[PDB]
Every structure is written in structure tokens, then in C-alpha cells.
């Protein structure tokens, strides 16, 4: 059990992102809608800035932490990785 050329789920998913056999990212993109307009802006999950709503300006996120955190009352769908 647990061949090292063909691991399970468990024996990958834990590990730090460079210590897989793949060395993928760890992040994704999203779409976000504001109450004050009809738009979709496309925003980065670990944004690390304040981003002004596409065509509006009010800030859809705060840059805080190692993962950025959406401004309140703004709805958010996710997107694929593919």
C-alpha cells in the first residue's frame, strides 16, 4: 500500500504545496457582485490589496491576513481551476 508514484488522497492533501509531486498552486479566482451596481469583477482569493469594484469604487475586499476577506453584503460565486 501507498506506492510513491501513485499516492492516495490523504497522503497528498495534508502536505505543504511544494512537497507534493505536482507543486500546484493553492488558490483560485472568484466573481463578485456589489449592491451598488450591476457588474462582475474577477478577484483573487489571496488578493493582498484593496480592490475597487469594477466600475464603481468602494472596495470588495480588505487585504488582511494570508487570505483576503470580502467586504460585507457583496455576493460571491467561485470559478473553475481548469
Amino acid at each position: 500500500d501507498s506506492d510513491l508514484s501513485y499516492p492516495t488522497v490523504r497522503s497528498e492533501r495534508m502536505k505543504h504545496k511544494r512537497r507534493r509531486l505536482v507543486q500546484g498552486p493553492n488558490s483560485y479566482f472568484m466573481d463578485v457582485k456589489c449592491p451598488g451596481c450591476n457588474a462582475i469583477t474577477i478577484v483573487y482569493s489571496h488578493a493582498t490589496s484593496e480592490v475597487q469594484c469594477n466600475g464603481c469604487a468602494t472596495k470588495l475586499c480588505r487585504p488582511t491576513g494570508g487570505k483576503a476577506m470580502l467586504t460585507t453584503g457583496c455576493g460571491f460565486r467561485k470559478k473553475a481551476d481548469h
Partner: protein, 129 residues
């Protein structure tokens, strides 16, 4: 830092074959490491292996048997000639029976028997028992 890629393979492989592992991981990779395994793999010291792609630097995996005892590299890559071989065979190998020394010759990467036969000298590379 990381200097020799080659010896960062053959040291891993060696140790693991003692410790009772049936497989090994080898984190950097080279156009040298590959060849060195291909040799061994003929005789039966190495059973198979895989080569994984990451598009930066590869990884490699190795299978094992129990029929390998030690392998290593002879680091400065000294020089050898048609009579010279018997020096190395009296030294690094335990006997003139079952060992092999590995060389890089004009023709390509080979093992001492083959070398002498075709009458090339060349630099030296590593060994395996």
C-alpha cells in the same frame, strides 16, 4: 549548496536498500542519473523506474530487489586508459568477480567490461556492486 547532482542520487539509493525500503524518491534529476540507472537495470540491480515531470526540474522514483549492496560515485572524475582499469578493480570493488565500475567513454556511458572489450578508455563516474 547543491554541487553534485549524481551523488545526491546514488547516496539515497544505497542507504534505502539497507533500511529495507522497496522504493526511493530522488528529488533532483539529470541526463546522467537516468543513464546510470539504465545500466544497472539490465543486470537486475534496479527493477524498473518512473520519471515524473514538473516542468521545472524532474523527480524520479526507483524500485528495488535486494540484489544491490552499495552504489556511489567517485567524485573528481579521474581518468582511465586501457591497462589502467585493473587499478580501480583491485581498489573500489571487493573482487574481480561480480562488481562493476561505471565510466563515461567517447562512445557513451558504459561499464568497465564493455569498455575494455571495445578498447576505449575514458573518465570514471561511479560504481555498483
Amino acid at each position: 549548496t547543491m554541487m553534485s547532482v549524481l551523488a545526491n542520487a546514488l547516496r539515497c539509493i544505497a542507504s534505502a536498500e539497507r533500511r529495507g525500503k522497496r522504493q526511493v524518491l530522488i528529488r533532483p534529476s539529470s541526463k546522467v542519473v537516468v543513464k546510470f540507472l539504465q545500466v544497472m537495470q539490465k543486470h537486475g540491480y534496479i527493477g524498473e523506474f518512473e520519471i515524473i515531470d514538473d516542468h521545472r526540474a524532474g523527480k524520479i522514483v526507483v524500485n528495488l530487489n535486494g540484489r544491490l549492496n552499495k552504489c556511489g560515485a567517485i567524485c573528481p572524475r579521474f581518468d582511465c586508459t586501457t591497462p589502467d582499469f585493473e587499478k580501480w578493480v583491485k581498489n573500489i570493488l571487493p573482487s574481480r568477480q561480480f562488481g562493476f565500475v561505471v565510466l563515461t567513454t567517447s562512445l557513451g556511458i558504459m561499464d568497465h567490461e564493455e569498455a575494455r572489450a571495445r578498447n576505449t578508455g575514458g573518465k570514471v563516474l561511479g560504481f555498483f556492486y
